[PDB]
């Protein structure tokens, strides 16, 4: 597998695994929502709104959107008094033959110029997975980040579970509105 269950509470499961040559573990969060797949797609489209629910987001803006792709700008906070780091993210929406929806996620540091006063997050990578249930949708959120930002790698690793846990919990509360 490589994976191992790291947390299970409030209906959410988070898996982690080592990635060779990195000091940061990859996570995979899992939750099941009473919503349709395209209800989560809408929320993930509304990047201007990330800051409203998505944890540790100080600010967010949609830069560009097509049918299949999107770019948004984020200013990230942190659980500790460290400088904020910002970044541009590329989402790519794919609908598989079976109605499963995959949103491929990718940091793109050079899309906009550096905003100086701020550290630019280096490449990140992962995806959301949205697969319909009889009555809802099964949600996967998986990310691996490389070294960068204002939070020591050793610190981000020891706290890596709280990112998908906090995100999925907030996306659940948020869809309920
Ligand atoms: Mn299910």
PDB file of C-alpha atoms and ligand atoms in Angstrom:
ATOM      1  CA  UNK A   1       0.000   0.000   0.000  1.00  0.00           C
ATOM      2  CA  UNK A   2       2.439   2.586   1.293  1.00  0.00           C
ATOM      3  CA  UNK A   3      -0.585   4.140   2.982  1.00  0.00           C
ATOM      4  CA  UNK A   4      -1.592   3.877   6.606  1.00  0.00           C
ATOM      5  CA  UNK A   5      -4.618   5.282   8.384  1.00  0.00           C
ATOM      6  CA  UNK A   6      -3.554   8.287  10.456  1.00  0.00           C
ATOM      7  CA  UNK A   7      -6.902   9.649  11.587  1.00  0.00           C
ATOM      8  CA  UNK A   8     -10.612   8.833  11.691  1.00  0.00           C
ATOM      9  CA  UNK A   9     -13.066  11.170  13.392  1.00  0.00           C
ATOM     10  CA  UNK A  10     -16.288  12.975  12.528  1.00  0.00           C
ATOM     11  CA  UNK A  11     -16.778  10.797   9.469  1.00  0.00           C
ATOM     12  CA  UNK A  12     -13.448  11.616   7.855  1.00  0.00           C
ATOM     13  CA  UNK A  13     -10.457   9.382   7.240  1.00  0.00           C
ATOM     14  CA  UNK A  14      -6.931  10.617   6.562  1.00  0.00           C
ATOM     15  CA  UNK A  15      -4.130   8.471   5.138  1.00  0.00           C
ATOM     16  CA  UNK A  16      -0.461   9.329   4.906  1.00  0.00           C
ATOM     17  CA  UNK A  17       2.561   7.713   3.350  1.00  0.00           C
ATOM     18  CA  UNK A  18       6.243   8.372   3.091  1.00  0.00           C
ATOM     19  CA  UNK A  19       7.570   9.566  -0.252  1.00  0.00           C
ATOM     20  CA  UNK A  20      11.200   8.617  -0.828  1.00  0.00           C
ATOM     21  CA  UNK A  21      13.620  11.545  -0.961  1.00  0.00           C
ATOM     22  CA  UNK A  22      11.129  13.892   0.683  1.00  0.00           C
ATOM     23  CA  UNK A  23      10.811  14.834   4.380  1.00  0.00           C
ATOM     24  CA  UNK A  24       7.116  15.520   3.832  1.00  0.00           C
ATOM     25  CA  UNK A  25       4.470  12.780   3.765  1.00  0.00           C
ATOM     26  CA  UNK A  26       1.753  12.657   1.147  1.00  0.00           C
ATOM     27  CA  UNK A  27      -1.770  12.737   2.495  1.00  0.00           C
ATOM     28  CA  UNK A  28      -5.124  11.393   1.303  1.00  0.00           C
ATOM     29  CA  UNK A  29      -8.300  12.530   3.017  1.00  0.00           C
ATOM     30  CA  UNK A  30     -11.620  10.784   2.557  1.00  0.00           C
ATOM     31  CA  UNK A  31     -15.139  11.891   3.413  1.00  0.00           C
ATOM     32  CA  UNK A  32     -18.620  11.046   2.154  1.00  0.00           C
ATOM     33  CA  UNK A  33     -21.034  13.875   1.532  1.00  0.00           C
ATOM     34  CA  UNK A  34     -24.784  14.071   1.078  1.00  0.00           C
ATOM     35  CA  UNK A  35     -24.322  16.029  -2.101  1.00  0.00           C
ATOM     36  CA  UNK A  36     -23.989  15.448  -5.801  1.00  0.00           C
ATOM     37  CA  UNK A  37     -20.563  15.417  -7.489  1.00  0.00           C
ATOM     38  CA  UNK A  38     -21.429  18.590  -9.427  1.00  0.00           C
ATOM     39  CA  UNK A  39     -22.273  20.336  -6.129  1.00  0.00           C
ATOM     40  CA  UNK A  40     -18.659  19.949  -5.080  1.00  0.00           C
ATOM     41  CA  UNK A  41     -17.444  20.972  -8.528  1.00  0.00           C
ATOM     42  CA  UNK A  42     -19.307  24.265  -8.151  1.00  0.00           C
ATOM     43  CA  UNK A  43     -17.635  24.977  -4.807  1.00  0.00           C
ATOM     44  CA  UNK A  44     -14.208  24.155  -6.229  1.00  0.00           C
ATOM     45  CA  UNK A  45     -14.997  26.501  -9.136  1.00  0.00           C
ATOM     46  CA  UNK A  46     -15.798  29.412  -6.857  1.00  0.00           C
ATOM     47  CA  UNK A  47     -12.198  30.327  -6.013  1.00  0.00           C
ATOM     48  CA  UNK A  48     -13.209  33.840  -4.972  1.00  0.00           C
ATOM     49  CA  UNK A  49     -14.984  32.047  -2.121  1.00  0.00           C
ATOM     50  CA  UNK A  50     -12.191  29.733  -0.913  1.00  0.00           C
ATOM     51  CA  UNK A  51     -11.214  32.202   1.799  1.00  0.00           C
ATOM     52  CA  UNK A  52     -14.719  31.743   3.239  1.00  0.00           C
ATOM     53  CA  UNK A  53     -14.332  28.060   4.223  1.00  0.00           C
ATOM     54  CA  UNK A  54     -10.980  26.724   3.085  1.00  0.00           C
ATOM     55  CA  UNK A  55      -8.775  26.753   6.218  1.00  0.00           C
ATOM     56  CA  UNK A  56      -5.769  29.072   6.512  1.00  0.00           C
ATOM     57  CA  UNK A  57      -6.760  31.007   3.388  1.00  0.00           C
ATOM     58  CA  UNK A  58      -6.415  34.728   4.085  1.00  0.00           C
ATOM     59  CA  UNK A  59      -7.442  35.701   0.567  1.00  0.00           C
ATOM     60  CA  UNK A  60      -8.367  34.156  -2.763  1.00  0.00           C
ATOM     61  CA  UNK A  61      -9.118  35.187  -6.319  1.00  0.00           C
ATOM     62  CA  UNK A  62     -10.092  33.438  -9.543  1.00  0.00           C
ATOM     63  CA  UNK A  63      -7.599  34.462 -12.241  1.00  0.00           C
ATOM     64  CA  UNK A  64      -8.880  32.480 -15.215  1.00  0.00           C
ATOM     65  CA  UNK A  65     -11.470  29.809 -15.927  1.00  0.00           C
ATOM     66  CA  UNK A  66     -12.310  27.685 -18.940  1.00  0.00           C
ATOM     67  CA  UNK A  67     -14.540  24.594 -19.096  1.00  0.00           C
ATOM     68  CA  UNK A  68     -11.771  22.199 -18.177  1.00  0.00           C
ATOM     69  CA  UNK A  69      -9.210  24.368 -16.356  1.00  0.00           C
ATOM     70  CA  UNK A  70      -8.743  27.093 -13.783  1.00  0.00           C
ATOM     71  CA  UNK A  71      -6.223  29.355 -12.077  1.00  0.00           C
ATOM     72  CA  UNK A  72      -6.660  31.085  -8.743  1.00  0.00           C
ATOM     73  CA  UNK A  73      -4.542  33.109  -6.377  1.00  0.00           C
ATOM     74  CA  UNK A  74      -4.272  32.323  -2.695  1.00  0.00           C
ATOM     75  CA  UNK A  75      -2.746  34.092   0.281  1.00  0.00           C
ATOM     76  CA  UNK A  76      -2.145  31.451   2.962  1.00  0.00           C
ATOM     77  CA  UNK A  77      -2.219  31.892   6.741  1.00  0.00           C
ATOM     78  CA  UNK A  78      -0.819  29.395   9.249  1.00  0.00           C
ATOM     79  CA  UNK A  79      -1.553  27.932  12.698  1.00  0.00           C
ATOM     80  CA  UNK A  80       1.604  29.693  13.957  1.00  0.00           C
ATOM     81  CA  UNK A  81       2.978  33.234  13.774  1.00  0.00           C
ATOM     82  CA  UNK A  82       5.034  32.661  10.631  1.00  0.00           C
ATOM     83  CA  UNK A  83       4.902  34.792   7.498  1.00  0.00           C
ATOM     84  CA  UNK A  84       2.089  34.120   5.021  1.00  0.00           C
ATOM     85  CA  UNK A  85       2.962  32.391   1.768  1.00  0.00           C
ATOM     86  CA  UNK A  86       0.999  32.911  -1.434  1.00  0.00           C
ATOM     87  CA  UNK A  87       0.641  30.956  -4.654  1.00  0.00           C
ATOM     88  CA  UNK A  88      -1.136  30.373  -7.906  1.00  0.00           C
ATOM     89  CA  UNK A  89      -2.891  27.053  -8.420  1.00  0.00           C
ATOM     90  CA  UNK A  90      -3.913  25.230 -11.560  1.00  0.00           C
ATOM     91  CA  UNK A  91      -6.978  22.934 -11.333  1.00  0.00           C
ATOM     92  CA  UNK A  92      -7.832  20.626 -14.219  1.00  0.00           C
ATOM     93  CA  UNK A  93     -11.304  19.067 -14.363  1.00  0.00           C
ATOM     94  CA  UNK A  94     -11.716  15.607 -15.886  1.00  0.00           C
ATOM     95  CA  UNK A  95     -14.863  13.489 -16.131  1.00  0.00           C
ATOM     96  CA  UNK A  96     -14.090   9.788 -16.471  1.00  0.00           C
ATOM     97  CA  UNK A  97     -16.191   7.340 -18.486  1.00  0.00           C
ATOM     98  CA  UNK A  98     -18.033   6.270 -15.326  1.00  0.00           C
ATOM     99  CA  UNK A  99     -19.072   9.720 -14.094  1.00  0.00           C
ATOM    100  CA  UNK A 100     -16.202   9.964 -11.648  1.00  0.00           C
ATOM    101  CA  UNK A 101     -14.802  13.491 -11.565  1.00  0.00           C
ATOM    102  CA  UNK A 102     -11.101  14.150 -11.028  1.00  0.00           C
ATOM    103  CA  UNK A 103      -9.734  17.660 -10.396  1.00  0.00           C
ATOM    104  CA  UNK A 104      -5.974  17.618 -10.914  1.00  0.00           C
ATOM    105  CA  UNK A 105      -4.170  20.246  -8.845  1.00  0.00           C
ATOM    106  CA  UNK A 106      -0.801  21.837  -9.488  1.00  0.00           C
ATOM    107  CA  UNK A 107       1.155  24.772  -8.062  1.00  0.00           C
ATOM    108  CA  UNK A 108       2.360  27.169 -10.759  1.00  0.00           C
ATOM    109  CA  UNK A 109       4.691  29.659  -8.922  1.00  0.00           C
ATOM    110  CA  UNK A 110       5.587  31.739 -12.033  1.00  0.00           C
ATOM    111  CA  UNK A 111       2.061  32.361 -13.363  1.00  0.00           C
ATOM    112  CA  UNK A 112       1.953  35.750 -11.662  1.00  0.00           C
ATOM    113  CA  UNK A 113       5.054  37.738 -10.591  1.00  0.00           C
ATOM    114  CA  UNK A 114       6.309  37.352  -7.033  1.00  0.00           C
ATOM    115  CA  UNK A 115       4.434  39.540  -4.588  1.00  0.00           C
ATOM    116  CA  UNK A 116       7.241  40.769  -2.459  1.00  0.00           C
ATOM    117  CA  UNK A 117       6.434  41.001   1.211  1.00  0.00           C
ATOM    118  CA  UNK A 118       5.603  37.363   0.769  1.00  0.00           C
ATOM    119  CA  UNK A 119       7.080  33.896   0.110  1.00  0.00           C
ATOM    120  CA  UNK A 120       5.838  32.106  -3.017  1.00  0.00           C
ATOM    121  CA  UNK A 121       4.871  28.439  -2.496  1.00  0.00           C
ATOM    122  CA  UNK A 122       6.957  26.160  -4.726  1.00  0.00           C
ATOM    123  CA  UNK A 123       5.439  23.309  -6.720  1.00  0.00           C
ATOM    124  CA  UNK A 124       2.616  21.358  -5.059  1.00  0.00           C
ATOM    125  CA  UNK A 125       0.679  18.433  -6.614  1.00  0.00           C
ATOM    126  CA  UNK A 126      -2.320  16.159  -6.117  1.00  0.00           C
ATOM    127  CA  UNK A 127      -6.014  15.837  -6.862  1.00  0.00           C
ATOM    128  CA  UNK A 128      -9.582  15.763  -5.723  1.00  0.00           C
ATOM    129  CA  UNK A 129     -11.674  12.771  -6.682  1.00  0.00           C
ATOM    130  CA  UNK A 130     -15.453  12.934  -6.798  1.00  0.00           C
ATOM    131  CA  UNK A 131     -17.344   9.651  -7.273  1.00  0.00           C
ATOM    132  CA  UNK A 132     -21.172   9.542  -7.017  1.00  0.00           C
ATOM    133  CA  UNK A 133     -22.968   7.278  -4.490  1.00  0.00           C
ATOM    134  CA  UNK A 134     -26.544   6.110  -4.561  1.00  0.00           C
ATOM    135  CA  UNK A 135     -27.479   9.201  -2.607  1.00  0.00           C
ATOM    136  CA  UNK A 136     -24.359  11.397  -2.530  1.00  0.00           C
ATOM    137  CA  UNK A 137     -20.680  11.565  -3.365  1.00  0.00           C
ATOM    138  CA  UNK A 138     -17.486   9.946  -2.149  1.00  0.00           C
ATOM    139  CA  UNK A 139     -14.700  12.525  -1.891  1.00  0.00           C
ATOM    140  CA  UNK A 140     -10.948  12.046  -2.073  1.00  0.00           C
ATOM    141  CA  UNK A 141      -8.422  14.832  -1.380  1.00  0.00           C
ATOM    142  CA  UNK A 142      -4.778  13.918  -1.981  1.00  0.00           C
ATOM    143  CA  UNK A 143      -1.711  16.236  -1.932  1.00  0.00           C
ATOM    144  CA  UNK A 144       2.063  16.080  -1.799  1.00  0.00           C
ATOM    145  CA  UNK A 145       4.132  19.235  -1.285  1.00  0.00           C
ATOM    146  CA  UNK A 146       7.894  19.725  -1.733  1.00  0.00           C
ATOM    147  CA  UNK A 147      10.166  21.963   0.431  1.00  0.00           C
ATOM    148  CA  UNK A 148       9.214  25.646   0.530  1.00  0.00           C
ATOM    149  CA  UNK A 149       7.441  28.457   2.359  1.00  0.00           C
ATOM    150  CA  UNK A 150       7.887  29.821   5.892  1.00  0.00           C
ATOM    151  CA  UNK A 151       7.029  26.620   7.803  1.00  0.00           C
ATOM    152  CA  UNK A 152       9.898  24.162   8.414  1.00  0.00           C
ATOM    153  CA  UNK A 153       9.423  20.850   6.569  1.00  0.00           C
ATOM    154  CA  UNK A 154       9.746  19.031   9.894  1.00  0.00           C
ATOM    155  CA  UNK A 155       6.800  21.070  11.176  1.00  0.00           C
ATOM    156  CA  UNK A 156       4.527  20.659   8.156  1.00  0.00           C
ATOM    157  CA  UNK A 157       5.028  16.885   8.299  1.00  0.00           C
ATOM    158  CA  UNK A 158       4.090  16.537  11.976  1.00  0.00           C
ATOM    159  CA  UNK A 159       0.887  18.485  11.217  1.00  0.00           C
ATOM    160  CA  UNK A 160       0.182  17.066   7.771  1.00  0.00           C
ATOM    161  CA  UNK A 161      -2.988  15.269   8.928  1.00  0.00           C
ATOM    162  CA  UNK A 162      -4.788  18.458   9.941  1.00  0.00           C
ATOM    163  CA  UNK A 163      -4.771  19.817   6.392  1.00  0.00           C
ATOM    164  CA  UNK A 164      -7.051  17.309   4.672  1.00  0.00           C
ATOM    165  CA  UNK A 165      -9.043  16.799   7.886  1.00  0.00           C
ATOM    166  CA  UNK A 166      -9.727  20.509   8.269  1.00  0.00           C
ATOM    167  CA  UNK A 167     -10.390  21.045   4.587  1.00  0.00           C
ATOM    168  CA  UNK A 168     -12.889  18.204   4.112  1.00  0.00           C
ATOM    169  CA  UNK A 169     -14.666  19.103   7.360  1.00  0.00           C
ATOM    170  CA  UNK A 170     -15.042  22.673   6.208  1.00  0.00           C
ATOM    171  CA  UNK A 171     -16.098  21.752   2.696  1.00  0.00           C
ATOM    172  CA  UNK A 172     -18.801  19.575   4.306  1.00  0.00           C
ATOM    173  CA  UNK A 173     -20.076  22.390   6.559  1.00  0.00           C
ATOM    174  CA  UNK A 174     -19.901  24.709   3.595  1.00  0.00           C
ATOM    175  CA  UNK A 175     -21.957  22.565   1.186  1.00  0.00           C
ATOM    176  CA  UNK A 176     -24.678  22.403   3.849  1.00  0.00           C
ATOM    177  CA  UNK A 177     -25.487  26.070   3.165  1.00  0.00           C
TER     178      UNK A 177
HETATM  179 MN1  LIG B   1     -20.273   6.072  -0.781  1.00  0.00          MN
END
